[PDB]
Amino acid sequence: KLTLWTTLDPSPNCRIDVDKDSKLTLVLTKCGSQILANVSLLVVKGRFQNLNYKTNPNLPKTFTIKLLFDENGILKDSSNLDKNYWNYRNQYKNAVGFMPNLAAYPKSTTTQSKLYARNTIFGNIYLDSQAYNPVVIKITFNQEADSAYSITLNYSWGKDYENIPFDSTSFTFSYIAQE
Amino acid sequence: KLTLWTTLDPSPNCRIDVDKDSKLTLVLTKCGSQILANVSLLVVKGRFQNLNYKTNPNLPKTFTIKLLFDENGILKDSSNLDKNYWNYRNQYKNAVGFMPNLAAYPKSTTTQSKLYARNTIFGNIYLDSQAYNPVVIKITFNQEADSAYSITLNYSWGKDYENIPFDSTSFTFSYIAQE
Amino acid sequence: KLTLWTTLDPSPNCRIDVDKDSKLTLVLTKCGSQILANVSLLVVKGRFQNLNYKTNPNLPKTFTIKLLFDENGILKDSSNLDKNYWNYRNQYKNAVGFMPNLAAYPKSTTTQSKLYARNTIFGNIYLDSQAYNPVVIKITFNQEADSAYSITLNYSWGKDYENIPFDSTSFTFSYIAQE
């Protein structure tokens, strides 16, 4: 009832560029009016598996993973996360109690040039369990115009990494629940 | 019963320098012995609404918001937060269960004004949803000698911001509850 | 029943180098599938009580505190934390519900000493309630080969501190519970 998560299954479950290029671990625990969230990310194959900006001049320093939800709090197929890996810890009918509160985190109006900053959380996370491999995780609620609710995970970094795996440490955050 | 918060009402509710110059969003959720806290801050008018240190030589790079509580956990009149915006999520009589634990976070003795470091939490938060607009939030418990309990929110920054709104990202923390 | 903690007893309770050289405050609160954790550390005597790299050339800039648990989630005598200071908030028989999940945070296999990055959390904490005294706390789960479960707290810093007490600010994190 009270936890929505990616399983701990070792199978890849997420698309950054290509199907199953990544494994997202996301745990959402309902503590009444707040969701306690825990996240980590491993890239298992493709261009972000091993970062080397000395040898690959064309490699970006960002990617984004989106969880898109309908008006019943059901994960949409268009999400980067595979629906087959998303369920209660013990497919579901209602998870509006896990959704980011729309009054707290309003969607952008047609006339609105961006979201309120309160819709965003920043975290400093690290690759390969080392403090000198920083990555910025930018978590934004309800940014995706075509979904009832959304959680957007933007990863970005500045370092010219040389043969560093995108294998992230864990980060905790919370957000205000819709109900 | 289990969440004490500022409403999500769009109305300003907080005084930095002037009445209703700011809108504090603070959610305290009781998970037994710990309070799970979520905070953001928007300045709606006055000298901190738009930061420009190129054009305003006299502008500080800090301000402080205090929540002062009596022995029943009731918000006191001299608090920066307006009492009309502070209530259980669904005029309260007792909120000692939400107060920062006095054994964990002792008040300063007459022979020292200087608290144990455990009474303080630091967070790195950001303005206008950009990682290159850092602000330090310093949360201190029970620093106010003249109140039974207190939560002090000190905001400070170093950057000579040029036309940046004080519109903060969200931050989560926790603290040990009095009961 | 839902909180496992170091008491708030003012007595030292922890060994960095020598018995009772430190006082760890650690609070683990069970919110179903996640443990909400709160930590601070005061060094009360010995070489880390007052850091001065100007006057002591031989002083390290790191130390580690380990909590080692048996298959019933009972703190082992080999831990840096003294067992006499570790109990439920209101000697215990079973605390597996507080243990770091072995599927989430696997122990290193004979064929690899190297943990998944998701076993680690980094935090930036501070000494003496000042933002310009940074310390890195590195929390790692299930790293200790000789125990069923473990929480390892590695503290490190870079600054040539001059007469700064190791009196840390508080930090919140969470982790996935074994059951």
Numbering used by the authors:
A (entry chain B), B (entry chain A), C (entry chain C): 186 to 275, 283 to 371
Copy the relevant paper text.
Each protein forms key interactions to promote cell infection, with the terminal domain of the fiber, the fiber knob protein, interacting with the viruses’ primary cell entry receptor. The adenovirus fiber knob protein is known to have a highly conserved trimeric structure. Sialic acid (SA) usage has been proposed as a cell infection mechanism for EKC causing HAdV-D. Here we highlight an important role for SA engagement by many HAdV-D. We provide apo state crystal structures of 7 previously undetermined HAdV-D fiber-knob proteins, and structures of HAdV-D25, D29, D30 and D53 fiber-knob proteins in complex with SA. Our findings demonstrate a conserved binding site for sialic acid, common across the species D adenoviruses, therefore suggesting that, along with CAR, the receptor can be used to initiate cell entry.
HAdV-D15, D24 and D32 were crystallised in only their apo states, whereas HAdV-D25, D29, D30 and D53 crystals were also soaked with sialic acid. In this article we present seven novel structures of apo state fiber-knob proteins of species D adenoviruses. These provide a good basis from which to conduct structural analyses.
